Amino acid sequence: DSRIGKLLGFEWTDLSSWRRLVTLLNRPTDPASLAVFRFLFGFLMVLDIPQERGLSSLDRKYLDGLDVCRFPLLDALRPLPLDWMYLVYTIMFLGALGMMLGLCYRISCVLFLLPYWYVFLLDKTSWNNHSYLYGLLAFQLTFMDANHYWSVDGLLNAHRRNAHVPLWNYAVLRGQIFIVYFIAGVKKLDADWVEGYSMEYLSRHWLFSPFKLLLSEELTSLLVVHWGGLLLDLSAGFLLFFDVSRSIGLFFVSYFHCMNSQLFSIGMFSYVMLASSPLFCSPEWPRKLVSYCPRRLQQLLPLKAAPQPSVSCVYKRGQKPGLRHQLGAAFTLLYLLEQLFLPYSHFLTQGYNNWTNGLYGYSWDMMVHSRSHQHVKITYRDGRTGELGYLNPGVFTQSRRWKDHADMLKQYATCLSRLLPKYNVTEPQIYFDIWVSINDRFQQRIFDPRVDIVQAAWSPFQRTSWVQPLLMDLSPWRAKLQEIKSSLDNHTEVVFIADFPGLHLENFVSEDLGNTSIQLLQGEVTVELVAEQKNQTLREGEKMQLPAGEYHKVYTTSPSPSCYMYVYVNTTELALEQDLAYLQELKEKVENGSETGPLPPELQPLLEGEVKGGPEPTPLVQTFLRRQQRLQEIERRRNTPFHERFFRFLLRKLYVFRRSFLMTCISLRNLILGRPSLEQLAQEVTYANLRPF
Amino acid sequence: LDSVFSSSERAHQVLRIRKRANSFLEELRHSSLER
Numbered sequence: 001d002s003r004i005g006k007l008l009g010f011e012w013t014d015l016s017s018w019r020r021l022v023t024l025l026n027r028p029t030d031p032a033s034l035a036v037f038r039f040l041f042g043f044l045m046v047l048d049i050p051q052e053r054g055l056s057s058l059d060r061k062y063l064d065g066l067d068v069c070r071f072p073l074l075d076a077l078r079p080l081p082l083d084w085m086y087l088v089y090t091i092m093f094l095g096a097l098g099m100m101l102g103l104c105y106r107i108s109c110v111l112f113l114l115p116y117w118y119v120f121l122l123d124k125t126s127w128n129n130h131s132y133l134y135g136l137l138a139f140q141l142t143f144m145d146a147n148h149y150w151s152v153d154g155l156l157n158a159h160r161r162n163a164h165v166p167l168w169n170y171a172v173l174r175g176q177i178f179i180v181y182f183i184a185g186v187k188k189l190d191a192d193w194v195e196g197y198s199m200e201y202l203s204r205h206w207l208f209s210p211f212k213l214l215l216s217e218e219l220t221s222l223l224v225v226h227w228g229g230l231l232l233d234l235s236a237g238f239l240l241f242f243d244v245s246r247s248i249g250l251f252f253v254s255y256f257h258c259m260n261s262q263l264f265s266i267g268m269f270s271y272v273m274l275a276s277s278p279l280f281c282s283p284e285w286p287r288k289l290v291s292y293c294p295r296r297l298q299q300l301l302p303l304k305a306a307p308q309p310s311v312s313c314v315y316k317r318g319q320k321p322g323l324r325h326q327l328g329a330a331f332t333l334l335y336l337l338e339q340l341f342l343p344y345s346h347f348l349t350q351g352y353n354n355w356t357n358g359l360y361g362y363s364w365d366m367m368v369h370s371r372s373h374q375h376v377k378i379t380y381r382d383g384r385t386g387e388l389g390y391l392n393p394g395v396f397t398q399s400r401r402w403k404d405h406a407d408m409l410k411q412y413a414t415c416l417s418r419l420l421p422k423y424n425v426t427e428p429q430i431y432f433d434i435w436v437s438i439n440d441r442f443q444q445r446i447f448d449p450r451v452d453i454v455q456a457a458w459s460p461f462q463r464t465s466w467v468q469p470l471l472m473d474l475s476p477w478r479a480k481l482q483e484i485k486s487s488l489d490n491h492t493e494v495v496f497i498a499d500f501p502g503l504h505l506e507n508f509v510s511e512d513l514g515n516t517s518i519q520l521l522q523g524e525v526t527v528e529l530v531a532e533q534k535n536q537t538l539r540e541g542e543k544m545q546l547p548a549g550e551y552h553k554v555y556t557t558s559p560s561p562s563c564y565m566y567v568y569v570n571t572t573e574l575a576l577e578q579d580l581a582y583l584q585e586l587k588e589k590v591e592n593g594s595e596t597g598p599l600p601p602e603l604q605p606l607l608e609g610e611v612k613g614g615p616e617p618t619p620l621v622q623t624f625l626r627r628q629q630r631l632q633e634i635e636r637r638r639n640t641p642f643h644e645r646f647f648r649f650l651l652r653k654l655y656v657f658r659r660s661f662l663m664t665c666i667s668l669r670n671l672i673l674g675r676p677s678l679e680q681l682a683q684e685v686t687y688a689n690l691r692p693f
Numbered sequence: 694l695d696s697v698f699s700s701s702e703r704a705h706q707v708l709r710i711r712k713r714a715n716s717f718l719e720e721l722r723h724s725s726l727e728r
């Protein structure tokens with residue numbers, strides 16, 4: 001009756017006492033929308049297990065006998081052998097199918113939940129927001145009575161056939177989606193999102209073509225992409241709940257998610273959010289959709305009559321609340337409070353803090369920070385002889401996220417410490433030097449390059465002392481530097497560097513990179529050439545021509561950070577391009593009839609196009625033929641029909657699913673009936689990898 | 694194999710031309726099979 005009563009659905013007096021709150025949170029509600037969401041979520045996760053979880057690639061990630069450095073949340077966790085991992089994924093698949101079909105719902109939910117979180121916590125390099133969301137949804141749905149409508153348990157059990165469900169089942173999901181939208185929006189109130197730096201190059205996609213009929217590219221990249229996204233997050237959080245705004249909110253949210261699906265490669269996140277969007281609608285929309293159909297079709301679709309009473313609700317005649325109702329209310333309140341708190345819990349677990357806040361995955365800060373790494377050097381000093389050596393940047397690793405987090409760096413250092421003695425290295429001391437820029441800033445060190453990470457100190461609840469601060473004082477320079485980026489030719493390239501007081505950088509210019517120069521933008525540096533031991537002190541706005549093929553050091557000798565730049569052009573590439581262009585001009589002259597004089601013998605293979613019955617072509621001729629073939633391939637790719645691409649996509653996905661199924665079969669057979677001789681295994685592995693055709 | 698170790702000449706090369714990777718940290722598993 002009250003206006004608040006219709007707007008919000010509940011009256012204020014319901015919150016006076018615990019009993020009234022429990023009765024409100026356990027009132028009857030229709031089960032249809034929850035059942036549809038359960039079906040869609042189960043089906044999408046079933047499709048997602050062989051694609052993103054990595055069951056197709058599981059045989060080259062956890063291969064037995066290979067030594068790789070793992071990054072688990074807890075050091076205690078260790079992967080099992082490959083076959084048991086295949087069994088774990090089979091259990092996941094069975095649980096997901098059970099959730100989809102509503103068959104043994106609680107058991108299926110547990111079988112999906114526990115393996116999923118095991119995989120999620122086993123590796124920190126595979127964390128993203130849309131995996132955390134799937135984990136949370138699986139956790140929530142374990143307790144919700146979602147097997148009441150369109151479920152096989154209903155057919156096998158009369159009491160759970162089209163029955164009522166309590167109201168907090170919908171409330172928890174609605175709150176979760178609202179939290180996702182709102183926290184994503186508020187997290188996007190950052191200086192690098194409101195000013196157009198994050199996703200600065202996404203306005204070129206053809207989906208934004210109509211906007212370009214009325215707005216320029218720069219304006220389209222700010223008003224639509226950034227401010228539009230932020231406003232859509234906050235407004236889509238609020239609007240869908242209210243009755244009046246549901247249609248416009250649904251339209252904008254659906255357009256937003258379809259554009260996200262096409263623009264990015266996030267995966268199944270867009271479809272999951274689309275499936276969750278109807279959940280804010282009335283709890284009985286599928287029933288009225290079913291009713292408005294022919295009777296013959298209604299003979300196959302689920303029941304349409306009013307639901308029967310359930311014992312998971314409190315009815316007002318009354319009925320004193322039991323125990324599960326109180327637990328449901330407490331679970332709802334505590335879970336939503338924890339969900340609000342966790343994204344902002346970064347001041348307690350300070351070990352994981354960096355330039356960004358906390359580990360990625362549970363902050364809802366999607367597509368806000370972009371990083372470009374320029375150089376990574378790993379140096380080791382032997383603990384017996386004193387020799388100094390250099391390792392490859394990414395050895396014994398499968399991801400590139402260790403370059404930005406202190407904990408992963410410490411784990412990598414310990415892994416290298418335990419592995420290197422297999423290669424005649426005594427107790428080593430490992431030093432790291434990583435150059436990274438976030439949102440197009442100066443390249444700067446992230447970690448102190450004088451600290452042995454093997455013996456350094458790290459605890460989750462105390463700040464790490466060997467992470468360099470982000471120099472945010474140089475923020476406005478991002479304008480001017482960009483101008484210098486646009487003043488160059490098609491050959492010249494520029495790299496910007498900002499360095500701390502006391503430190504130095506030692507660099508080696510390759511023989512190819514002739515005509516390399518160094519200019520100083522701010523501060524005071526001294527550049528040392530070591531071939532003749534000569535150092536020159538550069539003032540602001542002075543340029544030097546560095547040697548090619550030697551080592552040079554740049555030292556910072558000012559109390560404040562110094563900013564400089566390297567400008568270089570590749571001489572070998574330019575010379576090859578010019579010679580190839582001359583050759584192409586001669587070829588064209590021959591083709592059109594000009595150059596009546598005899599062709600050189602080396603040119604005869606070029607016209608023939610095949611090396612048969614003659615001397616082997618020079619490397620330049622081979623490069624020309626390769627370039628021509630690549631250009632022809634690209635041209636053929638461009639002039640390609642859509643239907644062929646669609647058929648190829650279907651075939652590729654078929655191959656992925658086939659490989660997953662066959663390899664899982666091999667693993668299960670090995671577990672149960674033992675391992676055959678090696679020849680049969682080789683034959684089977686050859687059979688599985690066969691392309692479908 | 695002997696790909697664990699590298700050389701001083703090829704380690705101290707800040708200026709090496711390469712491609713650009715946005716690395717949004719939200720797009721699937723990035724290069725996937727490559728690395």
Ligand SMILES: C/C(=C\Cc1c(C)c(O)c2ccccc2c1O)CCC[C@H](C)CCC[C@H](C)CCCC(C)C
Pocket residue numbers: 180181184223224225226228229230232233252255256259260264266269270273366367
């Ligand atoms: C990349 C963007 C957001 C990140 C993101 C993603 C990928 C999600 O999966 C989310 C899911 C749920 C909640 C938040 C999510 C999220 O934050 C902006 C997307 C680019 C751009 C804004 C799309 C353009 C379409 C809108 C409708 C334009 C309206 C502009 C009017 C002026 C017409």
Ligand SMILES: *[C@@H]1O[C@H](CO)[C@@H](O[C@@H]2O[C@H](CO)[C@@H](O)[C@H](O)[C@H]2NC(C)=O)[C@H](O)[C@H]1NC(C)=O
Pocket residue numbers: 502503504526528533534535555556557
């Ligand atoms: C060239 O200039 C640099 C700039 O400092 C000189 O470096 C210092 O060199 C001394 C002697 O090796 C070291 O003890 C200091 O620690 C260095 N300073 C810093 C900040 O690291 C260098 O010696 C000069 N070279 C020559 C050949 O004169």
Ligand SMILES: *[C@@H]1O[C@H](CO)[C@@H](O[C@@H]2O[C@H](CO)[C@@H](O)[C@H](O)[C@H]2NC(C)=O)[C@H](O)[C@H]1NC(C)=O
Pocket residue numbers: 510512513570572573576708709710
């Ligand atoms: C500079 O430009 C040259 C142009 O060739 C690049 O070179 C090739 O370099 C790769 C290794 O990176 C060789 O395998 C190829 O054979 C070279 N191609 C030739 C000679 O045609 C080179 O990588 C660029 N960068 C640097 C630092 O030199």
Ligand SMILES: *[C@@H]1O[C@H](CO)[C@@H](O)[C@H](O)[C@H]1NC(C)=O
Pocket residue numbers: 422423424
């Ligand atoms: C030396 O290192 C090589 C490379 O592994 C190998 O011969 C062995 O590990 C070591 N042998 C001796 C005698 O040091």
